[PDB]
Amino acid sequence: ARVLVSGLQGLGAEVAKNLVLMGVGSLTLHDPHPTCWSDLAAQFLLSEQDLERSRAEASQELLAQLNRAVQVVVHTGDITEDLLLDFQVVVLTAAKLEEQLKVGTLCHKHGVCFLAADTRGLVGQLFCDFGEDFTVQDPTEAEPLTAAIQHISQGSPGILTLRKHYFRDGDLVTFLNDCDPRSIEIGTFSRYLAITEVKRPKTVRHKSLDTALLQPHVVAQSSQEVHHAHCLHQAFCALHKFQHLHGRPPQPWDPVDAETVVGLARLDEALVRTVALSSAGVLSPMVAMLGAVAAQEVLKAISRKFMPLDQWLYFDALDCLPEDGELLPSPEDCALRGSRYDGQIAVFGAGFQEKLRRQHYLLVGAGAIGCELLKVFALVGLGAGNSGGLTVVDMDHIERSNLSRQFLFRSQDVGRPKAEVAAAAARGLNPDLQVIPLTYPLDPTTEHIYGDNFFSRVDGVAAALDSFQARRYVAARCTHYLKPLLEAGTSGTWGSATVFMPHVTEAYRAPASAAASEDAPYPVCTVRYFPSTAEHTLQWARIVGQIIPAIATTTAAVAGLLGLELYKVVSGPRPRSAFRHSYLHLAENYLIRYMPFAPAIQTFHHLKWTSWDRLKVPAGQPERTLESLLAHLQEQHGLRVRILLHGSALLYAAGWSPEKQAQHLPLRVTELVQQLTGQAPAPGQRVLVLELSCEGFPPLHYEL
Amino acid sequence: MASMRVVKELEDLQKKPPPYLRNLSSDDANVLVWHALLLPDQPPYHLKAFNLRISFPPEYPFKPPMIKFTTKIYHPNVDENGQICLPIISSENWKPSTKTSQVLEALNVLVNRPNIREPLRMDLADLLTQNPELFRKNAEEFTLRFGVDRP
Amino acid sequence: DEPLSILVRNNKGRSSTYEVRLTQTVAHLKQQVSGLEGVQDDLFWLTFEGKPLEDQLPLGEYGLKPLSTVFMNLRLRGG
Numbered sequence: 001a002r003v004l005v006s007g008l009q010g011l012g013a014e015v016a017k018n019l020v021l022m023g024v025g026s027l028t029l030h031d032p033h034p035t036c037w038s039d040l041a042a043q044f045l046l047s048e049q050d051l052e053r054s055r056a057e058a059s060q061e062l063l064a065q066l067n068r069a070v071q072v073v074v075h076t077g078d079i080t081e082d083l084l085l086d087f088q089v090v091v092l093t094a095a096k097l098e099e100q101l102k103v104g105t106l107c108h109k110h111g112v113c114f115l116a117a118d119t120r121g122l123v124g125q126l127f128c129d130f131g132e133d134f135t136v137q138d139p140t141e142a143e144p145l146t147a148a149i150q151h152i153s154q155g156s157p158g159i160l161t162l163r164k165h166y167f168r169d170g171d172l173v174t175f176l177n178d179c180d181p182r183s184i185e186i187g188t189f190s191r192y193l194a195i196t197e198v199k200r201p202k203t204v205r206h207k208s209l210d211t212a213l214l215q216p217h218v219v220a221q222s223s224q225e226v227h228h229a230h231c232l233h234q235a236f237c238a239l240h241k242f243q244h245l246h247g248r249p250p251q252p253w254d255p256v257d258a259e260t261v262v263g264l265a266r267l268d269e270a271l272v273r274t275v276a277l278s279s280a281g282v283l284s285p286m287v288a289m290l291g292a293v294a295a296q297e298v299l300k301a302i303s304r305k306f307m308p309l310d311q312w313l314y315f316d317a318l319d320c321l322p323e324d325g326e327l328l329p330s331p332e333d334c335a336l337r338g339s340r341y342d343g344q345i346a347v348f349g350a351g352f353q354e355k356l357r358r359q360h361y362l363l364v365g366a367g368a369i370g371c372e373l374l375k376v377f378a379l380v381g382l383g384a385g386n387s388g389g390l391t392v393v394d395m396d397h398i399e400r401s402n403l404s405r406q407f408l409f410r411s412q413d414v415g416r417p418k419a420e421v422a423a424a425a426a427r428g429l430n431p432d433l434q435v436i437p438l439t440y441p442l443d444p445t446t447e448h449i450y451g452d453n454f455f456s457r458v459d460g461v462a463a464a465l466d467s468f469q470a471r472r473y474v475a476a477r478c479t480h481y482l483k484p485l486l487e488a489g490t491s492g493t494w495g496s497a498t499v500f501m502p503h504v505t506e507a508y509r510a511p512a513s514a515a516a517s518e519d520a521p522y523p524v525c526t527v528r529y530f531p532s533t534a535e536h537t538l539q540w541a542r543i544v545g546q547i548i549p550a551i552a553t554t555t556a557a558v559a560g561l562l563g564l565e566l567y568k569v570v571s572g573p574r575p576r577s578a579f580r581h582s583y584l585h586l587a588e589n590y591l592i593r594y595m596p597f598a599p600a601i602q603t604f605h606h607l608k609w610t611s612w613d614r615l616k617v618p619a620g621q622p623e624r625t626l627e628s629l630l631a632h633l634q635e636q637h638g639l640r641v642r643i644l645l646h647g648s649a650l651l652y653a654a655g656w657s658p659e660k661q662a663q664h665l666p667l668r669v670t671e672l673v674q675q676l677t678g679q680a681p682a683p684g685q686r687v688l689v690l691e692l693s694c695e696g697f698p699p700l701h702y703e704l
Numbered sequence: 705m706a707s708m709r710v711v712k713e714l715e716d717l718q719k720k721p722p723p724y725l726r727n728l729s730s731d732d733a734n735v736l737v738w739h740a741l742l743l744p745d746q747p748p749y750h751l752k753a754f755n756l757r758i759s760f761p762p763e764y765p766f767k768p769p770m771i772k773f774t775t776k777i778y779h780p781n782v783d784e785n786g787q788i789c790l791p792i793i794s795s796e797n798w799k800p801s802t803k804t805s806q807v808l809e810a811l812n813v814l815v816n817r818p819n820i821r822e823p824l825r826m827d828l829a830d831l832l833t834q835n836p837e838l839f840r841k842n843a844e845e846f847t848l849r850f851g852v853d854r855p
Numbered sequence: 856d857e858p859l860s861i862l863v864r865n866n867k868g869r870s871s872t873y874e875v876r877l878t879q880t881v882a883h884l885k886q887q888v889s890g891l892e893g894v895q896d897d898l899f900w901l902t903f904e905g906k907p908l909e910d911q912l913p914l915g916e917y918g919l920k921p922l923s924t925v926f927m928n929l930r931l932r933g934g
């Protein structure tokens with residue numbers, strides 16, 4: 001197919017990158033605007049050198065190198081009612097509501113798919129028009145259900161069999177034998193020798209932009225998200241009217257323009273005031289998220305696979321700015337300084353940039369989500385200096401199949417560790433950033449590498465892993481060291497983004513049942529020799545590798561959500577009312593962004609503790625004996641001791657014998673551990689962790 | 705919490721030991737490996753006991769323990785290496801709300817008399833099904849040749 | 856306390872019908888859904904009108920209505 005994209009503000013750049021990655025047949029990109037400093041804060045294809053140049057020509061080569069098999073082309077001139085008819089779909093980003101109306105009316109009068117995507121500040125707006133009659137083939141996104149059969153017969157209402165899904169009633173099914181579908185008791189042949197169902201296409205009617213603007217129809221999962229979307233739409237209309245009337249965009253954080261914008265609209269006056277004040281720049285996370293959504297809509301408007309979006313979509317993230325009980329950014333602070341961050345500084349300020357320049361972060365897994373996270377980090381400026389940095393850790397090599405999901409990987413870059421090349425690409429994004437690659441898995445066998453000194457510098461961890469065991473282990477390490485965790489997970493079209501902040505949210509609760517399934521031993525007698533019950537007979541020889549091909553739209557969305565979370569994670573202490581977990585299903589237009597739960601407390605005989613808490617007990621000057629330790633525990637707290645063990649070895653028992661107990665009571669804890677386990681104590685380790693149970697549970701931190 | 709529950713259950717098991725278990729012992733180094741000696745009552749398995757292991761997983765509640773034997777028992781439900789199949793510990797039957805005592809009692813029931821339903825050793829299953837007299841005559845000789853010293 | 860019928864939508868696109876009373880915990884409905892769909896209770900959660908649903912609270916707290924929709928959300932790995 002051939003797709004036209006108009007306006008490479010950075011949202012258009014994200015859309016074009018997604019389309020080229022997915023494999024769009026031909027892409028024509030049109031942008032005459034010259035590149036300025038205020039455009040580098042979100043556009044990852046430009047640079048400092050490509051300044052005072054047209055965005056289209058500058059980004060053409062960078063987009064072409066991504067696939068080299070899509071033939072990206074640049075158009076110079078103007079869009080008339082001659083080039084519109086040659087493209088299957090036209091995407092427009094950041095127009096002026098005049099070109100929007102003209103192109104939309106022309107597209108509706110000629111029957112071509114029309115998309116409008118806009119990102120002003122933190123708020124994003126999307127609009128689709130697929131025409132007056134669009135037919136979609138398979139609005140399921142899942143394999144059609146199947147069932148087995150044994151035998152049938154003949155009857156006027158019909159007779160069906162079922163050998164052991166639910167087929168409901170009245171739908172269409174297939175198999176008489178290899179014939180047309182028959183509606184169903186199956187809707188002249190009395191004999192008996194699997195069954196599969198089929199789906200129906202759906203028809204959808206859309207309106208033109210001129211008609212749709214009069215009365216919108218927004219996609220909302222509840223009823224409290226509709227008035228909010230209406231207020232956002234009114235604010236966007238007021239902003240467009242202001243831009244047309246005055247001829248300039250409102251100044252960043254300017255209090256004089258906000259009054260005019262508010263008076264023009266007149267409703268949520270505070271909301272429109274706040275969006276007007278902050279509508280001055282483009283940020284990498286919001287751009288990435290809206291670009292992922294728009295690219296998915298464009299792709300589903302070509303294959304006609306999933307259900308088109310409704311008229312309007314509005315995305316609102318107004319919780320990344322300082323809270324009400326804080327200091328708002330000032331116009332002097334949010335002033336352009338000729339550096340490649342003016343987009344962020346236009347809404348946040350130079351103080352936030354200074355804060356973000358120093359943080360040090362760890363990234364586990366340089367893969368699909370990892371590359372997008374690296375790009376978002378590079379464009380925002382985590383580190384990029386001498387007082388900060390970044391670390392990337394991964395263990396896998398690069399295979400040929402990684403090229404189809406290779407945002408930062410090249411064909412000549414096969415056969416070398418992923419962490420090194422990912423760090424090299426991130427350095428290429430800006431040389432100021434310093435990234436350290438480590439090719440060692442983070443599992444309970446290389447713990448000596450990642451000790452206390454290693455986590456003494458890390459200020460946060462971002463995990464992008466393809467397992468539950470590794471995710472639970474990383475969460476356990478992070479909660480041991482009391483560090484924020486940023487987790488993301490994608491599968492097909494489903495995606496989730498979550499943040500775990502110590503002492504204000506709940507700890508990561510891994511599903512134990514799921515993690516047990518992975519690395520399961522050979523089933524000795526379930527089905528090995530006699531039985532063959534289901535299709536899973538492949539286990540006899542040794543779903544084979546559990547391969548899930550992720551699409552580039554989900555990874556971009558989850559990366560953008562993670563960046564949005566980071567924006568307020570590195571913004572100091574927050575009251576837990578300003579944190580969100582997000583779940584999204586793009587194919588069904590499902591998006592939820594909710595407030596997480598407070599940590600759950602547990603109470604024993606007299607002990608009130610959460611999942612973050614721990615027991616801290618020091619030692620004496622030479623050392624303290626086990627009897628002294630138990631006495632101190634029973635004195636400071638009411639907790640008695642029944643069993644006290646260290647890992648897989650136990651040091652104490654509630655009842656063994658007077659002799660067995662008196663053998664161990666007058667001994668040093670370190671001496672006892674060395675006596676049980678012949679391995680020497682770790683010199684780098686400072687704190688020993690002990691597990692204890694009362695008579696009849698937070699760990700014991702033995703500060704050596 | 706797979707190293708806490710095992711040691712919390714071993715004490716309870718030793719409090720009221722079953723009549724068919726003897727020398728229930730641990731290593732005190734790794735708390736996730738047990739030891740025992742059981743003397744089955746049904747003949748010709750009443751002569752000598754047999755050693756075994758109750759090896760535990762790193763996540764015991766959500767995985768079945770491995771109950772590999774150690775002696776040279778001849779029985780049409782155990783492999784020549786020492787492994788044994790039990791329906792209680794299976795992917796379609798294992799549950800996180802089951803104790804080790806029920807597993808061991810099911811083991812005792814299984815070793816009392818072969819179930820001849822899903823035999824792991826196909827050679828002895830046919831001999832038991834057709835001519836039990838020869839199988840009984842040879843099992844005692846095999847146990848005498850290889851078996852424990854005494855219960 | 857009269858029984859009320861609601862709709863539960865799963866990840867495969869279907870929307871089954873359940874009969875529950877607004878006096879029992881969400882854990883009971885999760886067990887019902889686990890039995891009807893054959894997935895573990897710890898492998899997913901439920902969502903209604905955006906906000907998730909806590910296991911230990913009665914369904915009357917959220918304020919459901921007849922023939923309402925409750926979505927399932929799996930705990931997904933990969934990436």
Ligand SMILES: Nc1ncnc2c1ncn2[C@@H]1O[C@H](COP(=O)(O)O)[C@@H](O)[C@H]1O
Nearest residue numbers: 365367368394396442465466470933934
């Ligand atoms: N615990 C871990 N430590 C380091 N790398 C990991 C860990 N778990 C997963 N990974 C890596 O994360 C990447 C996930 O793959 P993908 O989901 O395709 O990006 C792979 O490169 C894995 O090797």
